[PDB]
Amino acid sequence: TSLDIAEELQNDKGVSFAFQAREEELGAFTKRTLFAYSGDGLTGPFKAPASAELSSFLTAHPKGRWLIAFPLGTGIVSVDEGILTLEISRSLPEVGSGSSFYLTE
Amino acid sequence: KTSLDIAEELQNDKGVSFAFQAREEELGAFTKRTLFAYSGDGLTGPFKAPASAELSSFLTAHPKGRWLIAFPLGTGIVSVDEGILTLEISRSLPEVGSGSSFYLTE
Amino acid sequence: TSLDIAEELQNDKGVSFAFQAREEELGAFTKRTLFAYSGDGLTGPFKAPASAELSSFLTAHPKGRWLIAFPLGTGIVSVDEGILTLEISRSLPEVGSGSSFYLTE
């Protein structure tokens, strides 16, 4: 483990998300994992400003965004100009927890 | 970091076995608590089994008082009441497989 | 953590998969986790030769195969004669990341 950021983000509708970013070295490979939790429900996209460390981490993904599975539906996390966006495929009465990762050489 | 790791096997009347692992981790200002669940068995109704006091204690700590958990074929809710662990499922599962549920807190 | 193998595997349609195998000891219990990532899409099964360490890890599962949930669908990983197979329930336009684990005494 060469990194562990955690932070809580909030929009003005009141929704809170906690994120954890983690980096791990495995010989030739690196793993980067995003962890997300919210107790809230969500109907539209979630937008909130992120710290520079998180924005930096989130930009590193090879696809420029993080496909993430929650118990009730699927989201895409991306960052743009220090604004974090989580878009969802369907409205979620509760978000819950999920993670998204990639492995790289 | 890791300030806790309980693991146990629980069993019901039919003979359905679940293994659980509870984990706590400290991340500066934040704590993460993760429940991991595995069963090779299929499940049609709810799974009820007695849990150790450490596990019951861990499971009760959740801000919603229950653990929403995704398995490969369906969704479950884990809760504890009076030292009885209950896993309720949205649909019957021919195989449970593995899943995790966590939360982050300040 | 008593083990961490990671490798990249590749098939004839251009699809690359990264796998990480992990073993952890927890007092009386062991946990074995497979992690899988691919940025590619996948229509049929994914077949690729694996290292001996990975074949060995994958054979250890009590069911002889790993049921694994990806954001858009479900897969079964198994190994036979050092050939890794990932079968899918539906075609996946993108595979993303997932893990599968078991606990044992």
Side-chain angles (χ1 to χ4, degrees):
Chain A
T1 297
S2 61
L3 189 94
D4 265 319
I5 322 159
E7 61 195 75
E8 151 158 39
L9 267 50
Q10 193 157 357
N11 67 0
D12 13 48
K13 278 177 275 138
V15 190
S16 312
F17 262 84
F19 292 92
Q20 179 206 341
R22 171 183 278 156
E23 183 186 302
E24 288 158 276
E25 295 177 340
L26 315 154
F29 287 87
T30 322
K31 182 166 165 209
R32 293 198 170 83
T33 315
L34 183 64
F35 291 96
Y37 173 79
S38 177
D40 302 300
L42 198 60
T43 76
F46 175 85
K47 311 216 176 196
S51 82
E53 301 95 313
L54 192 59
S55 301
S56 190
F57 181 90
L58 292 181
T59 289
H61 197 290
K63 308 231 137 203
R65 53 73 173 149
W66 300 72
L67 177 74
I68 176 156
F70 295 104
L72 300 176
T74 281
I76 302 263
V77 182
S78 61
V79 78
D80 180 41
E81 226 82 78
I83 304 306
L84 176 151
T85 314
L86 198 151
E87 294 163 310
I88 46 167
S89 59
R90 78 167 68 205
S91 288
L92 301 167
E94 188 178 335
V95 175
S97 60
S99 71
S100 177
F101 69 79
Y102 72 98
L103 281 138
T104 198
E105 184 183 50
Chain B
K1 296 189 145 45
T2 298
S3 61
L4 190 92
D5 263 317
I6 322 159
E8 61 195 72
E9 151 155 41
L10 266 50
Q11 195 155 352
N12 71 354
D13 48 315
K14 283 146 223 214
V16 158
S17 312
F18 260 88
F20 293 90
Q21 177 204 343
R23 168 184 280 156
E24 185 186 296
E25 289 158 276
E26 295 177 339
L27 316 153
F30 290 83
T31 319
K32 186 169 160 211
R33 295 196 168 84
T34 311
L35 185 61
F36 290 94
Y38 170 77
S39 177
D41 301 299
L43 201 54
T44 77
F47 174 84
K48 308 215 179 194
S52 76
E54 300 94 316
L55 193 56
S56 301
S57 183
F58 181 89
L59 296 177
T60 286
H62 199 288
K64 311 228 141 204
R66 50 73 172 151
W67 301 70
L68 179 74
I69 179 154
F71 295 103
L73 304 174
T75 278
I77 299 265
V78 177
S79 67
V80 78
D81 184 40
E82 223 85 74
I84 305 307
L85 181 149
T86 318
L87 198 149
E88 287 163 318
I89 48 167
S90 61
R91 74 171 68 204
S92 290
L93 302 169
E95 189 178 337
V96 174
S98 59
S100 69
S101 183
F102 69 81
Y103 71 95
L104 282 132
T105 197
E106 188 178 48
Chain C
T1 297
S2 59
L3 189 91
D4 267 317
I5 322 157
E7 59 197 74
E8 150 159 39
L9 265 46
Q10 194 155 357
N11 94 337
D12 54 26
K13 323 226 201 315
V15 188
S16 307
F17 261 88
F19 292 94
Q20 180 204 344
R22 171 182 278 155
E23 181 185 305
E24 286 160 279
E25 295 177 342
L26 313 157
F29 288 86
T30 320
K31 186 168 163 214
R32 291 197 173 86
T33 315
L34 182 63
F35 289 95
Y37 171 77
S38 178
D40 301 300
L42 198 57
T43 77
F46 174 89
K47 309 216 178 199
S51 77
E53 302 95 316
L54 190 60
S55 299
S56 188
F57 184 87
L58 296 174
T59 287
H61 196 291
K63 309 230 139 201
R65 51 76 171 149
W66 303 68
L67 178 72
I68 178 157
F70 295 103
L72 302 175
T74 277
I76 299 265
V77 181
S78 64
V79 78
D80 184 43
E81 226 81 74
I83 304 304
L84 179 152
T85 316
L86 197 153
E87 290 163 313
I88 47 171
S89 60
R90 75 170 71 203
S91 289
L92 305 167
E94 187 178 337
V95 172
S97 60
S99 68
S100 177
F101 69 80
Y102 72 93
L103 283 133
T104 197
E105 188 180 45

